[PDB]
Design a protein around this ligand. Sequence first.
Ligand SMILES: CCCCCCCCCCCCCCCCC[C@@H](O)O[C@H](CO[C@H](O)CCCCCCCCCCCCCCC)COP(=O)(O)OCC[N+](C)(C)C
Ligand SMILES: CCCCCCCCCCCC(=O)SCCNC(=O)CCNC(=O)[C@H](O)C(C)(C)COP(=O)(O)O
Lengths: 459, 67, 80, 98, 110, 88, 178, 128, 124
Amino acid sequence: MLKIIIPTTMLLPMTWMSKHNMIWINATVHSLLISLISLSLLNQLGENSLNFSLTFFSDSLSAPLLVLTTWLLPLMLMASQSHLSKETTTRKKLYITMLILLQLFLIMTFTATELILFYILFEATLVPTLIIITRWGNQTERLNAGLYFLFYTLAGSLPLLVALVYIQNTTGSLNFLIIHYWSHPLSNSWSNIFMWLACIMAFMVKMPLYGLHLWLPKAHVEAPIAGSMVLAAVLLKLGGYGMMRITTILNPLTNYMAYPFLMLSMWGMIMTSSICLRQTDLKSLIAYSSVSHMALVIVAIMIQTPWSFMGATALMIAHGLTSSMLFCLANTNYERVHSRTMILARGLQTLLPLMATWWLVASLTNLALPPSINLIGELFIITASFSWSNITIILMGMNMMITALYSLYMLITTQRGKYTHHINNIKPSFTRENALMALHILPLLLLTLNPKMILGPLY
Amino acid sequence: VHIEPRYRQFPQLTRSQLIQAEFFSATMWFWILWRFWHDSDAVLGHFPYPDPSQWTDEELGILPDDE
Amino acid sequence: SKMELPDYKQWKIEGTPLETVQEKLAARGLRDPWGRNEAWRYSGGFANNVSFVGALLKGFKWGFAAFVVAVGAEYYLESQ
Amino acid sequence: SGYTPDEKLRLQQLRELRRRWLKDQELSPREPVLPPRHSIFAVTHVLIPVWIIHYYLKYHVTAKPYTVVERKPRIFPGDTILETGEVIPLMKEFPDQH
Amino acid sequence: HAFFKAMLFMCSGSIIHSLNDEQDIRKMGGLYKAMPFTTTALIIGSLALTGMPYLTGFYSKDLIIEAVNMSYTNAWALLMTLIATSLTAAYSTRIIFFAFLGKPRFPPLV
Amino acid sequence: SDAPPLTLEAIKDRVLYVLKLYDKIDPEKLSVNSHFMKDLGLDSLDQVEIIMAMEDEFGFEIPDIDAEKLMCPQEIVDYIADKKDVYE
Amino acid sequence: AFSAPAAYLTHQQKVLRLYKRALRHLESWCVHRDKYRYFACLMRARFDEHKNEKDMVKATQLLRQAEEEFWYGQHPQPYIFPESPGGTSYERYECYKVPEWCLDDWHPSEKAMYPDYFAKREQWKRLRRESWEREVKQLQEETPPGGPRTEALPPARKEGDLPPLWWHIVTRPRERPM
Amino acid sequence: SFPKYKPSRLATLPATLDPAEYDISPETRKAQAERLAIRSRLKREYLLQYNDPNRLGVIEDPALIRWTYARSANIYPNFRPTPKTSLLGALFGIGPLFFWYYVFKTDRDKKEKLIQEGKLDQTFNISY
Amino acid sequence: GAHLARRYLGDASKEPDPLRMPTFPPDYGFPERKEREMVATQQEMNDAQLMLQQRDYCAHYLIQLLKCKRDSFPNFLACKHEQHDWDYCEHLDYVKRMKEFERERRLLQRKKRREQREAEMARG
Ligand SMILES: CCCCCCCCCCCCCCCCC[C@@H](O)O[C@H](CO[C@H](O)CCCCCCCCCCCCCCC)COP(=O)(O)OCC[N+](C)(C)C
Ligand SMILES: CCCCCCCCCCCC(=O)SCCNC(=O)CCNC(=O)[C@H](O)C(C)(C)COP(=O)(O)O
């Protein structure tokens, strides 16, 4: 699979050798070409995965994630160039270098065949994101946000490393294929319980789990638009991918160790959906939306059924696209008025009609309108949870009522009503923003046309 | 067709609207009368409702309080 | 188009329920100075209107005549 | 009661300015300077879609089993089957409660 | 029901559009003669709604009522259905009386 | 189409029309510049009734704070013209 | 909506507002015109029965009792004019109102149509630019040192000045913009 | 004379029925004068920048910034652990979790016990 | 209904129970009861696909009506005799059900009164 890894490592010196006014064009065109190249990984088998070599392999759960990452890099480049116009050439090249390194680390993360290398890369992804958030963030809180982003992750991931090496001393290997073929049951003991917790808490804090989610609003609000896009779309899916990979050795302990996490996930889904209704900030609303959706994903992964796995994969892909679009839409208004308060600029439909259409489509997709893949994943998870226990349809149902509310609320707050009289700097939307929104939204419906390709290996 | 405001006078009426309204009211009443003349049973009932009290005990078959 | 208001002196409360209102207020020592303003609602083409039963039987005469002639035709067409 | 002279004067001036502005909103005669068969509807809106739909249903959908299923037609005493020619017998000598 | 309900709404919309977007029936005067076609349509639709024999509402509502009266059902539901079908004629009468009968009550600019 | 584009002369004509049907106001003594309290000798309740008559005639409500200030028919005409953007 | 409010409402103003509200609600109750005229004359007699109360305390007590009776006997569904704050066409056309400064963002191809209109717009903008400083100076000179005490603005007084703060009142979009 | 109207939280008392506005003092008149003075000063400040030809952008509102900052960033510095705060936090953050855990555990135990006896009517239950 | 008033206000012990009916055997008061005969075979009723609720002792008239409705399709006003016959024999079935109800009612009241009278005779 080096045919995709090497082109990014070549993007690096290509960017560093370009002319001062041709960095954006070259980066965008070659990132798009790399995405087109990575499109070929979707040709998956039905029995076993594409084992490229002793170091890299591709399943049907990681191929959509790789395609999403390679597609998201050009969108981040397109969104970033507006507010970096006054920046010096060297610092622009450094920003593009950070983005390229993040994409490369994610690409090698989603295809590592051994758990320790996957851990190394999944932890190496911290550095570029933290550097971006702290260095190119707009407000003074960014510093603190970075700290909240860092340690919250590391405290969860440090025990996992220990557990990982312990496994290597017990079973003799950390290769995923050997681990799967040589799986043995986990007895009910305290040592096994703490091994379960050590293996699980890292991906729990990455999702994030309710109660462990305090870093997400800070990180997703104080970060620049590219940083917010990369945290919402792809970085939250690392926890889900890791949990799906790691739950093969935790049975049958999980059968009873999932209760506290299931209760936290469901009740915190309800709580975050309720929080989104009373929010004076527009970015925090999207952040808590992400928290709710990832809580649903956590429930699906924890109940451990094929339908739940397919729903979780589809929901991760759809949520990534939707949240990236919502963040870009909010950033357009922020760039216009230099404020994230939602009730500052109102009646924007009168002034920006096509952007109002983009807002409407993004919000409709957010609240899981059929037959979008958002609702496909949500409905599969709901059905699997109903099979798990019939009473779940209450809590899930409550969420499905609250979510839509806040979604439409946001729209009605931003696009409808009468315009603010004293705001007269609302320029017509550029071609760049409209193209960004179109490139966000069209793949969603195209995937709706063929939904079997984001439903995971359990399909 | 051009009609101007009247300001405290009866509005101007064209013959066509009066003709249409009268025709449609007349056709509704004609339809009702014709249907009642041909299908009265749909309103007044068609088959007679019997009185259970008049039914003799022989056809219903109960013994005369003896056995 | 290009229509002026009618004369204002033609409006009189005489012959309308406003006369009864003024007579009732005169027995109490009061007066109604706005009756002439409301006289137009009763004066001209709005002088009379049908009742509820009369409104329901709007096209009853024509419809019943048509029904009668149709029934007469039916009675003297089965004689074939 | 009523306006004060300052209020009356301000209303007067604002009214003159507002009327001037409203007059300026009118369009001069040249203002929109624009720079430089019978039953066709039933052919491109009914005939072509139905041709495409009939082709797709007859030659692609019907090529696989159970894609188009119709409920079995009703059979009464006295009809004749089209394929086998079987005639369904009459029905049990009505009691004739005339 | 689709037919006469949509047609009654269209008659109401015609009345609203004629009287400068006025929807309160308390300012709706004598439109029996001023709006002959609208009056005819609304009267026919109200009669059809009230289950007048041999109209559109008759062939469904009459059978519905006579099927409810002859079934093993809750008695309170039957009583409520009868009271509701009386109140139907009640509110149709209210609409007709206030909208089309009497003297004008709208602004003088006709 | 819709209602015609109301003009100033029409507004003044309607105002004087509705005022001339008031029993407490002399038709001949009433002019477009006549004061209700001074020239015509009416009290505040008569002004309230006159403003209500204007609201009924033209089909739009006049807020109380704006209504108290009107004292002559010219003031009512100017208020109605400003409210409905009548400029000719 | 146009007149500057005062610090408080006087007793006469409160009584007049109660009179208007009572008459309107009575009209809502009395649908027909003749009945409304009869009961409105009765209400006028009731109101002017106590017009000559020299003691303000008893007048305010009568006003209190009238407000309580009005609240008890008010129409639950009173008549509202279509464009009043409770009507069915209150803010119907606010979606069609666009501020004038948007015309500054038009492409030159769009501005090529309507050249005379944009010439007149340039005239108005230049007039505003030229009169802003004089407006500010007049407001500065006329304002008391403790700041303004009401929301009333002065008119123009000198040779060719314009009333201060006139741009956003004169250039209202419209009542029926589109 | 007539039945009284009593206000509630979601149906407040009308202005015309407020006793405090029919028993007045010159102190109340002075207070209303100051209120109108502050409101007029703020309105003049707003209208000076509102009509400025050279003003391009958003007129920053200190009140809006104060509102958002108080709602978001000023909460933790002014938080004190009190019996009321601790009790409400414990209740609203612990009670629902254990209640739902008990409900789901009871339901699943019942379901499993029914499964073991072999009487659940699990026919056609292929997808899970 | 009067039956509802009698059962819900009067003595319901001598009033028939529609759910639990009949409570007497079919040949108690009758020396012999003729078996009700059915005109349409199971196969004809299946082939016509009438309904599960239309497959009573009246199905032959319904089959005839459906056949004549299908035969004279455009003239939707021609199947009046068949409809009338089906409605008439429906009415006969309903009248038979009323007969069964009234028989059960008088059976219950007569039996209860006779039991009370026999007990009174045995009590003296
Ligand atoms: C804000 C969100 C942060 C993340 C939250 C994650 C939740 C982590 C909690 C871990 C869940 C399970 C842990 C322990 C497994 C069993 C639970 C135990 O309490 O139940 C009984 C255990 O009995 C007693 O409770 C022993 C535990 C008592 C000591 C633990 C302290 C509990 C107080 C709660 C402190 C909060 C912990 C989390 C801090 C953040 C079961 O009886 P028993 O069959 O014998 O034990 C089974 C194990 N065997 C088979 C080896 C014997
Ligand atoms: C439908 C249900 C509600 C209807 C019920 C309504 C009941 C209200 C009836 C009782 C109200 C009263 O009597 S309260 C009577 C109030 N009495 C006074 O105010 C005495 C001092 N007089 C003045 O202030 C002025 O003369 C003034 C009278 C304002 C005239 O103003 P103008 O001359 O300068 O226009």
